[PDB]
Structure 1
Amino acid sequence: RNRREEILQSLALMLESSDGSQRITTAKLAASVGVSEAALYRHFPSKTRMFDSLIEFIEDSLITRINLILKDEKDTTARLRLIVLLILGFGERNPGLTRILTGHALMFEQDRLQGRINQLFERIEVQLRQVMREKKMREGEGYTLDETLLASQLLAFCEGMLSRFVRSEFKYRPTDDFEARWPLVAAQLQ
């Protein structure tokens, strides 16, 4: 219920703390919300389910935000800019959810969790190639380079920004100087 949400947010926070270089315990978490260790399981069968709900929140957020973009912008280049900004801003506002995107927070959790993350990225990348291909349908003159290279190139930029954000201890924010960086990234597109 309402308590369910309040439990996930506490975890995302702990995931961004030193806990991530460690291991979140059902004990350390039930008190955060105040409820009993047992009452915690009334909303979550296990700690793994909590991660899933977090991963699921992540995919819903990204996927849904991307869909909106494609309806507010008809331009290919502008759509690409927004998708990257979207992934960088999301990370920045959710330092804990980023440690999952980067895998660091899944090291001592069900390796199956990394799988979901890996599938999510492929999903992102696939959406990115789909967008770039349409440039020929929208602008006639499309990209003279394979969309698979371009899309991966872009997602690598995003992942590299998130990775630098995590290791630096959230010091180097993903969006800092984004608009100054984007033109350099767009220069890679053809």
Structure 2
Amino acid sequence: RNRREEILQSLALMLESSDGSQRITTAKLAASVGVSEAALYRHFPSKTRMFDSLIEFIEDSLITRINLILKDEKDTTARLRLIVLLILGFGERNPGLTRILTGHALMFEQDRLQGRINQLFERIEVQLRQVMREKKMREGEGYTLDETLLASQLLAFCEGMLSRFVRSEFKYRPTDDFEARWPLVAAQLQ
């Protein structure tokens, strides 16, 4: 119930906190939830599972809002801008999950989990390319450069900002100066 979600909420908070640079032991996670280690296992079979649930929430949040953007906004460049802003905004709003997105928190857990995060990035990049491929249809002319190069370029930018947010103890917020940065990023869309 609120207990399962509660554990998850405490895990994200520890991830966001200074404890997030260290492994989140079941002991430490249990202490933070206010219950015993055993209590944790009534709701999850493993710690691996808790990260899986956190990753599911990240994928759902991002994929669902990406589709929302695609249905509401039809301008290709506007689409690109909004998806990038959504990723940075989502990361900034959830520092602990960003720590999962950048791979850092997963260093202590199952290699499979980083695999999940890589698939999520591939999905996002795949959507980026698709948006780019509709421009010719949408406005008469496509981009001159390879969409695969442009999309990796956009994602590289997002991953770079998230990585900085993480190394800086979350001081370098991902959306800071977004308005001044986007124009620079868009200049690449040739």
Q: TM-score, normalised by structure 1?
A: 0.97
Shift of residue 30 of structure 1?
Answer: 2.0
**Structure 1, unaligned stretches of length 5 or more?**
none
**Structure 2, unaligned stretches of length 5 or more?**
none
Q: Deviations over 1:131-187 (max 9, x none)?
A: 000001111111011100000000000000001111111001000110110011100
The share of aligned pairs that are identical, in percent, is 100
The equivalent of 1:44 in structure 2 is 44
Secondary structure at 2:43's aligned position in 1?
A: coil
Map residues 123-142 of structure 1 onto 2, 5 A cutoff.
Answer: 123-142=123-142
More moved, 45-54 vs 16-25: 16-25
Shift of residue 2 of structure 1?
Answer: 1.5
Shift of residue 72 of structure 1?
Answer: 1.1
Q: Distance in 2 between matches of 1:87 and 1:28?
A: 29
Secondary structure at 1:41's aligned position in 2?
A: helix
The count of corresponding residues between Structure 1 and Structure 2 is 190
Q: TM-score, normalised by structure 2?
A: 0.97
Pairing 1:72–2:72 present: yes
Shift of residue 36 of structure 1?
Answer: 2.5
Shift of residue 21 of structure 1?
Answer: 2.1
Shift of residue 38 of structure 1?
Answer: 1.3
Shift of residue 22 of structure 1?
Answer: 1.4
More moved, 38-47 vs 64-73: 38-47
Q: Distance in 2 between matches of 1:87 and 1:165?
A: 13
More moved, 147-156 vs 105-114: 105-114
Q: Deviations over 1:75-98 (max 9, x none)?
A: 000000000000000000111101
Shift of residue 43 of structure 1?
Answer: 1.1
More moved, 29-38 vs 155-164: 29-38
Secondary structure at 1:107's aligned position in 2?
A: helix
Shift of residue 111 of structure 1?
Answer: 1.2
